Each structure stands twice: as structure tokens, then as C-alpha cells.
A paper describes a structure:
The small protein AcrZ in [name] interacts with the transmembrane portion of the multidrug efflux pump [name] and increases resistance of the bacterium to a subset of the antibiotic substrates of that transporter. [name] is the energy-transducing component of a tripartite multidrug efflux machinery that includes the outer membrane protein TolC and the periplasmic bridging partner AcrA. To investigate how AcrZ affects [name], we determined cryo-EM structures of [name] and the AcrBZ complex reconstituted in a disc in which a bilayer of E. coli lipids is encircled by the membrane scaffold protein saposin A (Frauenfeld et al., 2016). Trimeric [name] cycles through three states in the transport process, and [name] associates with the subunits in the loose (L) and tight (T) states, but not with the periplasmic region of the open state (O).
To test the effects of cardiolipin on the conformation of [name] and AcrBZ, we reconstituted the proteins into saposin discs in which the E. coli lipids were supplemented with an additional 5% cardiolipin (i.e., to ∼10% total abundance). The increase in the cardiolipin content is associated with small changes in PC1/2 and PN2 for [name]. For the [name] set we used minocycline as ligand, and for AcrBZ we used chloramphenicol. Even though chloramphenicol or minocycline was added to other samples as well, density was not observed in this position for the maps for the AcrBZ and [name] structures in the natural lipid composition or [name] with cardiolipin supplement. The structural changes we observe are unlikely due to incubation with different substrates (minocycline versus chloramphenicol), because we do not observe density in the T or L pockets for either minocycline (in [name] ± cardiolipin with saposin A) or chloramphenicol (in the AcrBZ complex without additional cardiolipin with saposin A).
Residue numbers in the entry:
A (entry chain A): 301 to 350
B (entry chain A): 101 to 250
C (entry chain B): 1 to 1033
D (entry chain C): 51 to 100
E (entry chain C): 851 to 900
F (entry chain D): 11 to 166
Write the structure that this text describes.
Amino acid sequence: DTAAAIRAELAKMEPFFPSGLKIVYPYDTTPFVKISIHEVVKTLVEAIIL
Amino acid sequence: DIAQVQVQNKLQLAMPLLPQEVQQQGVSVEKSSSSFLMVVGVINTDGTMTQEDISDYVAANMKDAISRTSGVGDVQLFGSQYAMRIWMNPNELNKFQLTPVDVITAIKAQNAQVAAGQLGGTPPVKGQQLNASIIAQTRLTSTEEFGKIL
Amino acid sequence: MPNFFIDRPIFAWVIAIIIMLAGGLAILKLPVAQYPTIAPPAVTISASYPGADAKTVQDTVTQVIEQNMNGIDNLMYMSSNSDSTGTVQITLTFESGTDADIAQVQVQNKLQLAMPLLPQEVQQQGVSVEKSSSSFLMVVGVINTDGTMTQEDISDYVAANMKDAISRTSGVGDVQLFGSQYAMRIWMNPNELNKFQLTPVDVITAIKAQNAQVAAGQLGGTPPVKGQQLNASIIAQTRLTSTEEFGKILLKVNQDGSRVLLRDVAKIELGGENYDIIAEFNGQPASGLGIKLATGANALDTAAAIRAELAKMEPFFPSGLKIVYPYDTTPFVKISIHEVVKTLVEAIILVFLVMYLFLQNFRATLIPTIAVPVVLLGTFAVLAAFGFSINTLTMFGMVLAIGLLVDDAIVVVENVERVMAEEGLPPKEATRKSMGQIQGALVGIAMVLSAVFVPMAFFGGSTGAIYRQFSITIVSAMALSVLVALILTPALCATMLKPIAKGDHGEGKKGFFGWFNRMFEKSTHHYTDSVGGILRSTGRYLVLYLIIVVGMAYLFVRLPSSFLPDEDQGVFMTMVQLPAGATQERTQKVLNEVTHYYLTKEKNNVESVFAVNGFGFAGRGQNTGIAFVSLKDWADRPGEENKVEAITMRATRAFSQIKDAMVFAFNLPAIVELGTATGFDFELIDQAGLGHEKLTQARNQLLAEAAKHPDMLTSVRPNGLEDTPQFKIDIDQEKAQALGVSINDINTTLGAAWGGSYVNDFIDRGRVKKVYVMSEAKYRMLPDDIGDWYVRAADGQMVPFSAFSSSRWEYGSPRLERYNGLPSMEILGQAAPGKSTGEAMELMEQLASKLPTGVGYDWTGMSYQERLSGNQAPSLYAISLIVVFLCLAALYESWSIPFSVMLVVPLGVIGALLAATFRGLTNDVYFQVGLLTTIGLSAKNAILIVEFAKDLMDKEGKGLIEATLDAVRMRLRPILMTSLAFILGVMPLVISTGAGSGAQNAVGTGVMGGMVTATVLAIFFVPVFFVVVRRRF
Amino acid sequence: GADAKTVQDTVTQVIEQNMNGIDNLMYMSSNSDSTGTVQITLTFESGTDA
Amino acid sequence: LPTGVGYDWTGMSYQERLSGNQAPSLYAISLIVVFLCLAALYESWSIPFS
Amino acid sequence: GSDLGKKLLEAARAGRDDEVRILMANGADVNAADVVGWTPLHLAAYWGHLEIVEVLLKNGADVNAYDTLGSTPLHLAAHFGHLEIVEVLLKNGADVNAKDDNGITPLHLAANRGHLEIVEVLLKYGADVNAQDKFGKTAFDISINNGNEDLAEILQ
């Protein structure tokens, strides 16, 4: 949730950036914790299918 | 929260013991985990933007608005803001019989905002039709204004 | 459960006694306030860097704190306002559900570590973090009739003597002061300082040196010598108590031995700290203090105890002093909470005698008169458990529930009385047979209504705190009503009722009663034949349903949405705003005209006038002013021409003539701390380091381009202030050292002479007061007197300001506001009378996309809660409809049936939408709550029709049509009892003007309208829906 | 260095001036010694979070 | 004592009179809650009186 | 000081041509003055409104008017860089070598900010370059303190 608030606020600045500045995300641990839960969600879905 | 409160209530007894060189830099008390939640990088795609220029913009226009966020206990900047760094030279200071103490005195005597007062203030006299503020000095706000310091 | 509380009646009683006593421990403890804490918690940093401008504060005080408010939890705003008087005010705003104490300490501390960045001239004055409620429980004014006193003496006699006294009082919270406690001020005459070759610097020195406290030590202090028989503290020179003593301090000595003092150079007096504010109670020089409530206390008793504490000290203070109450709301809160008590006790009376009209049996009428008080008292107990309080919202919550309280009693009583009449069965068997029909329908209704009101509690944020009071109250009320209808009411029916044998349908003998029974039977037979005739014809009366739904949806859009009605709290306000560069004398000439108008032309209504010069809203400047107008009791103000909604217009019209003064009179909003008039709080932010001037250009542009669409934007105002003249002195740094003049001498002279410097503290009558130094007005009003101030060089020769300085004028801003760190300026406005707000928002966030490079927009205030909200109500009501459909399919055991019941929600809605249109009533929250109540009890009066018909077609197999006929016949009577009792108990709310008018009417009109329609339409449609659905499935 | 009266005037009567209006407060005592040391003891009701 | 001189308790002496003023309502709320429980258990107003 | 001049002062600072021309139709005073001593000429020259400053002097506005300290509208226009207003108020008879009570010409205000085009505009029309304030400061010394090279060579 904190990371979502931050990824929102950053979008709330890019329009006012001068010519050339760019935002990169070289390090984020959240991309893993919303994939670690998806591959188990679809796992227990395949489970009821099987 | 109450833990940070107790910790910060015990500083108040210690802060008057520290030098005016620490307080003036800003002490910081903060809950925190030891690992970075994340990192956010800023780059000028084209050019004409040195590390210094990107770090300034980051500190000024997107650091404070993120440290105020709810969930962010600590934020570390990979650089620093701007600052009118004044790189001095002794061979030109002993030539004028000067020293850094006089430099600092002149600066902090000429980069200062004075509590001037008020035109047509309070309590006024019967028959006053004017109210204005007074202004004597300002923060030099540039680089070509620090050089004219006498 | 019911068949349990028939052979065990006393058991039921001991519950109804407990949940009665449990209410008494809550009628006496529950805190009584006007409105609960709905606003978002907030705190206000405040700091007065004295004798300053708006940029000095922005750059030395505001930006510093604005950078170090890091790591605060649940933060939404960082609003900030720096003025020209010196006072910065920073207003944060946390979410809903936040502890105010924890947030307040987080701020206190994040500032305590920011303090050693501010100057040595704010740390002294200090800052003050305090919660923002803006809610004066009541204000107290103190006058001297004789005229021997001033504001600066009444203020002191209040602070040193009374502020303490009413602070030990029960539930008093924080006490604010108008005026300023005594302080010794030294007014200097630079024509005399040059003669003695002095300045306002060695004066600062001699006053800091000849008043300070010094530590000395002890005698015989440890470690001692063997043989000491004495220990006693040592006391050196200490503070100066009396002003005369200040005239005895030395500054210098001349060659001839002549000794210089203060008396011969300066003028010493006891006055106030800041003279900017000037209060007047009907022109009488006056002052006062303001009290706001402690969280979790009773306002009525608090005010009755303060009105006593102020008399306990009536005789002690001097003769000529009077105490008046300019602004109080308790005289209105007492009414607002009583006008409902006499409504609830009027409703139990009406439902008692209505059952004397239909049942014609004393023992049958007493039963609800016993159940309804039980339910109300249990509701009070439940509120007391959850920490809730007694408010206007919570009481109106049970007012518009009382119908659901009486409905769950008469449905139990009239059915047992119908059974005892149709079969002659005794009361015990008759009840145990009736509850064999209803015990499940009442639980289904409990679940339905729980699903209907509960979702209202999870809504937006500030409206959440209102809908939540309403929902908690009404849900508690119905949960207890259904229980006492399954616990107590049937036991009462088994004992208090009296046996009647079969054939006692009721014919009546002589009076109203025989006529009424006869006409009831006749109307029943005719209505029954009518419903049969309708059931023969579907389509007709199935297409009228679509006509009604279309009319409802088309009325739901010509209804101007609102939040709360403004009412007559007995007080309103006037605001004066003069041109820039305006003085105090002109503002007081305008406020005295205001006072003369209100005390000469409107003395039949107006009690008093409390004028304050310098205390304006959206500005503390010398330019503006405010006036709190108080009105006589509501019995002394009869009619409609003598209300505030009319005095406001009269006064606005009359003061429109006041030349060179923007005057505006307006009534108080219901929720003071909140925004009013359905406006929007837009604001421009500069995210490219643009100047104040370029952003001002952008704002003027946006305004000039927003008057282009007057169709949805009406009055788009800049809440801020336009730039105003200001005096720029330029200190020549060359010619200042060419003569040997220290610049910290120049700046100090200037600031002390024109702004005032907090020098030290002194003691008076056992209290600490301040020592201010300043010039005498005569010598500091205009330029060209600057040359009168001579500062001292090291060579002794004194130099004027004319040798160092050059002078000029410039238009610099008198107020600089911020938002979330970045500079900004606020822009207000409101949507056109017919257009909604969202349209005005999207329009001017489409007009803001066309502003120069680097200028962005943001919403604040009430408009921020609508960005993160709006899509809550539809989803929550959709899931509520799903819950209702499932709870009814469970009760009837069918997936189709429920729709019949679910097709009477638009009937009770069109009645309210027609009444609120014929009366000009907006779509308040009271209106939505009345819509929901009508929906709930209409669905209740329909659920039982369907349950009766279904049971007749399963247990007795009578058939579809015949069973529906029998059901509409059985249930006709109670439906009219409920509708009639509710209508009669609510009619006073539609008529009652005066106190609680805009709220009583807003509730009762919608309620009555929905009831008429859901009564005379639902008797006819729900059987049609039942038969239709049974045929189609 | 301050005697018992100077501190009841400067230090104590200005703190107990604000300590009124605190929630669930049974009583409050205060002591003002001659060494300048000052103590103020607020006693709240039982069941109160300290 | 002279006029303008009041008295007040504190410490355990405060709780002492607090309990002394509490006990009389306690002995009643604990009786009128036994009467009700008994009348409920046995469904009679005479059994609890006896 | 009349109700027709105050509206001119209000509309010239806010930049309104319709209201200003209307109020001038009704015979309003274009020599109006605030409590500081400012005609709408000063406000226009200060805030950058042309198409208005071109209008006030046609209606008979005093060009060399001075406030309670001696600041003409050239002083205000020459201090911010309104070239299209400087080349106007001079064509209409403004004293380029003027002086406030202090003693500064509009050169001493244009050489401070670096409005070199205005420096040329002014010294084209006889601006004194050997003039001094009450401090003994020319425009050359002021251009040297600020360390400019353009304004250093313009003045030889």
C-alpha cells in the first residue's frame, strides 16, 4: 500500500519534470509479493479444477 | 508510536547539551526497518543534467512530498540539495588581511531577513490613513548577489 | 423463543426492567452535545515572528517546519498561511479514525527538533500546537460600564483572575482569550535619545542586564567544615516588580555626574502585548474569553456550571464590571434536544389512542406504551456502550425509527386480537398461534433492515461520521424492537389482554366506535372487491408502475443535493473587508455603522453586537473585521420576517451601500468547523519554482476564463488577498561601514522601533508578564520620520537613517498561502443552482490543463473527500439489495417471490420526492435517511402480506387469489395504524418552525410524503406483484 | 538559584494553568523547592492508559 | 478552622471515602439483581422475597 | 480621492481596458492618486499593462507625475524591463534624467537588473551617465559592483 501511494505520487510529478528526466525503479520487492500470491491463487484454482 | 514518544521525550533533556553545530543541522528520530522498502532512481535521458542537478530536483520537488507519505518512516537521498558553496583561497585572504571568520560574519550579516516593523502600525494615532510593511534586507537568492557582499 | 416467553412471562419482564435500568445509567451519563466529532482531526501550529512581513515568515518559519514534518502517520494536508502581522498558521489534516493526541505529539516533536532552525525571536514567543475544532462552545464578554477601563485592563483582570477559575471547571477543555494580559511597554522618543546619545540597543542591553535573575547559592553549603550550624540560601538581585522601579535603572553617566535613567528618555506604561485586535460590545470598550468543550462531557451542565462559576466571583471584582454572553449555542441545543423528547412522548400517546380507536380496549393499548420506552432505553444503553453520545443526529435517528418501533408492537397485538375475534380462542392459545405466523417474518425483517442501514455507515469520510450515528442508532432500535416483539410483547399479550369469544369482530354501540367499526368493515369489503378487480387486470397497474418509477427517477435529478440545512442558532455573523492599505480607524468607523444599524433598526430582535477589529476569517489584518450578532429568544422573535434568513438579506442589502467596504452578513453553518454552501476548494500550486507574480497571473487568467462558463460556475473567488503597498528600505553596505556603523545595530533599531522586541520578563502580583520596547506612534507613522532615528557608530557621533538608506515602494503580497510544501493560492466557488458539483470540478480541472508550464492544481477541503469517494454508495446499495434478496428467498424459500417485496421501494420514494419538491427541500442527509426508513417499513408491511398469503397457500391451500385477498384484508388494519401514528407524530416536525426548523421539516416532509404513497399505493401493488410473480414462476 | 516563590510564579502557576482539561484526572499536587527544582504530580483515574 | 480554609483527602484516604460512598449502592445493585434472577428462574415474585 | 478615480486605480492594476475606457468616458481623473501617491500610469508601468498606458496619457494623464517619494512611472518601468512602455513614456514627454527624493535616475534602476536594451533606449535620449545619487554612485560603478560586462562596455 505504501509503495502504491508512492508510485501514485511519482506520477503526480512526471508532468512537471523538465525536458529529459525519467523515473526508474531499479529496486522493488513488491513485484515479488504480488506474484508470490498469484502463483498460489491460480494453484489452488487448478486444485479445485483437478 | 508511544515508544518513539518516550524516546523523543528523553532527547529534550539532552538536546540543550549538544553543540549549536548539531541542532543547527537537524536531529532525526524515526521508527524504521533496516532494509530499503524500495529505491527510486532519476536520470536525465538526454544530457545537460549532472548528478548534482538531478539530486537537487529530487530533494526539492519530490523528497519532502514523499517523506510526508503514510508508511514511509525514513528516506535517504543519493546526493544532496544545492547550496551556495563558497570555496575560499588563503593566498587571496592573507593578501587582504582577512580570515574565514570575517567572511562568515559578513555573510550572516548581509544574508539576513530583518523584522523591520510596520508603517502605520498599532497602536496608531488619530488621523492615520495608511498601513504598509517595511522591508530592509532579504535572502540574496542568487549567486551574483553573494559576490557583492562587502 | 416467543412460545418460551408465554408460560414464563416474568422472565421477559426482568429483561425489560434491566434494559430499562441499563438505559437510566445512560440517560444520566451520556454526554449531550450538538454535533459529534465528524470533521477530520487536525492541528494548528501557530507562530508570531513579531514586526515582520509575509516573506520573512515564509522563508524563516514556514518553509523550515514545512520540510521537517516528515514521517507523520495518516497525513493528508499541510496547509499553511503566512500573514503580514507576523503570525504563521499551519493546518495539517489527518484521516478519519486517527487519534488526535498521538498525531499532536508527533507534530509537537517533529517541531521540537525543528525549533533550533527558527530565529532567536520565535523560540521566545513560542509556537502552539493545538487541535482544530473552531468550535466555541460559548464565548464570555467582560465590560466596564463606567468607561474607566480599556480592553487591555479587562483582558488582564480576566486572565490573571478568571481564566484560572473557569479552568478548574467540569468539562472546559481549552480557554482562548481576546485581548492581552498586562505587559510593560517602553515607548521611546528618538528626539530624546539623540540628546543623550542613546539608541534602542543599549536600552535593550540595560533592560536585559538590570532585570535578569541570578543564581547565587547557599551558606554552610555541602561540603561543609566540621562545626557549621547554619544553612540558608542566598538571593541576589532579582526581577523588577513595579513599573516605577523600571524608571530607576541606569543607562549611562555624563561627565558632570548627572545620572541618566529611563524616565527622562522613554515613557513606561502597562498595556497589552499586541494591540492589533480591538473588541467592542455595542461600542463599550470590552473584551472576553472563549470556552470550547472537553471531549466526553455534557455541554448543558458545563454551561450551567460556568454561568455559576462566573457568579461565584460576581461580587469580588470591581464595581462597574459586567459579564455578558455574546455567543452561546446551549440555548439552542436544549431546545433541539427537547423538541424531539416531546415528539417521542407525543408519538407513544398517539399510538396509544389510535389503538383505543381501532382495538377499543385499554389493556390492548398499554402494551406498546410499555415496549417503545423499553426499546428507546435499550438504544440509549447501546449508544453508551459504544462511546456514542446524544446529539441532534442520534436523536433524529430514533425519531424516524419510532414507526418501526410501534410497527413491531401493533403487528403482534392486532394479530392476536384478530385471532381472538375470528376464533374466540383465549389470549394464550391465540398468541401461541399468531406467533406461529410471525416469529420468522420478524427475523427476516431484522436482517433486511440491518442490510438496509448498515451500509450507510461505511460511507465517504465526513458524511460517514453522520450516516454512522444514524445507522448505529436505527439498527440498535430495530434490533431491540424485534427482540421485545419476540420476548416481551407476546407475554404482555398473554396476560394483560382480556378474553373475547368468537363473533366479536367489533360492531360498536353508541359513539364514534360503532360508526368507526361499521365504516371500517364497509371500506374493507369495498377495498377488497377493488383489489380483486385490479387482480383481474394486469398491465394496467403494471404499466403505472413504470410511470411511477420514471417520475421518481426524473424527480431524483431536479433535487438540489445538499449536506445539512442551515438553521436559526440564535446568532449570525457580519464580515467587513476594506480596500488594501486600510487602517484601524476606518474599519472601526464601518463596524460602528454596523452596530448602529443593528441596535437602532433591529433592536426588536437583536440582543447585542460583539465587534472585533483584526479577527477576520481568512485574514488577521488591520484591514478586515468581524461581528458576532446575537438574537433574542425565539419567543421574542415570532414570524418568518424576524428570522436570520431574512435579517441576513436586510443587512446585506443595507450594507451594500457602505462605500469602500465589502460587507457580507451570513448565518452560521450547521457544522461550524466544516465547509458550507456545497462549494469547492480548488487551488493552484507552482511546481517549477515559479514566482508569486507568475502564479498570480495564472490565477487571474483562470478567473477571467471561468466567468466564461456562468452555466455551471457562479462565483469563483480568490480566498486570498491581493498585493498591497509596502516600504522597501535598502541599507547601503558601503556608507554604513564608511562611518563605522554595525548593521546588527541598524536592523535592531529598526525592528525595535517599528515592530517591538520581546526583551525580558518581569513579575507582577505573582505572575510573569512581558517587557516590550517600541517607539511612540507619533514618530513611526509615516516615512520622512525615518530621519529622526539616530544610531550610534563606534566613533560616538550618531548618524541618521538618511545617510545609510534609500527608500522605495513596491506591491508585495500581505498573505502567502501554501499547500503540501509548495507555494499555492486557493480558489473557491460553487456549482450553478441546477448543475451538480462533479461537473464544475471536471470543468475547471479541464480549464487548469491550459495554464502555463509548471502550474498544477489540487483539491482540498470537502472536495478532497469526494475524490477518494463517490463510488461507495452505489456498490454498497447493490450489495445491500443482494443481501435483501437472499434474506427474503431464505424466509419464503423461493428465488422469485422476493421481487414482489423488492418492487415497493420506488413507491415510498416518489412521495418524499413530491413533498420535498412542493416544499423546496433539498436532498439532505435527513432526506436520504427518511427515504430509507420509508423503504424499510414499506418492505416490512409488504413482507407480512406475502408471508400470510404464502402460508395460506401451503398450510391451507386456499389458492393464489383467495389467499392474497384474505391477506390484504387481514393486514389492512395495522398498516393504517402505523401510517397514521407515524404521520401524526411527524406532522409537528413538518410544521414546527423556530428551533430545529430546517431539520425537523427536512425529516418530516420526506417521511410523510413517502408514507402516504407507500401506504395508499402498497396496499394495491404488492398483491399484483405477488400474483404476477407466482404466475410467471 | 530561584527561590520557592519565584518558581511558583514563573514555572508552576503557568504549568498548572494549562494542566486543566485533561481527561480522567482525579487530582494534582505540586512542590516547589528552594533549589529551583519543581515537581508536579497528576493522578488520573483507574482504568486509564498511562 | 478559620474562613477560607478547606480540606481535602488524597492517597489511600481518597480511595477510602470513595469506597465508603460506593458500598451503599453496591449492596443494592447486588440485591436487586438477585431478586430479578430468582424471579426469572422460578417465575414468581414471592420466592425471591422469601 | 473621488469615487471615479479609485475605480481607475483598481482597474489599471488589474488590467481591464473596458472598465478603464468607460470610467474615462465619464470624466474621471486620470491624475488620481492612492494614499501613497500613484496614478494609474504608475500601476500600468509597474504591472506591465500596455494598451492602457497608451490610453491614460491620451486622456491627459501626467507623465512626469511623482509619488510621495519622487518615483515616476519611468522608475517603475525601467526597474522591471517594460521596453514597450519605456519607448512610450519617453515619446510622450517623460523626464529621463529624473530623480526621486533619494537621487536615483532610471539608469540607476535599469543597470541593477541588467536591462541593457533599456539602458540603450535611455542613453539614446540624453540620459546622464556621469550622474550620482546621494551616495556618489554612477551607473558605471553600479554595473561594476554587479560585475556585468555588457553594461560595462555600453558606458565606455
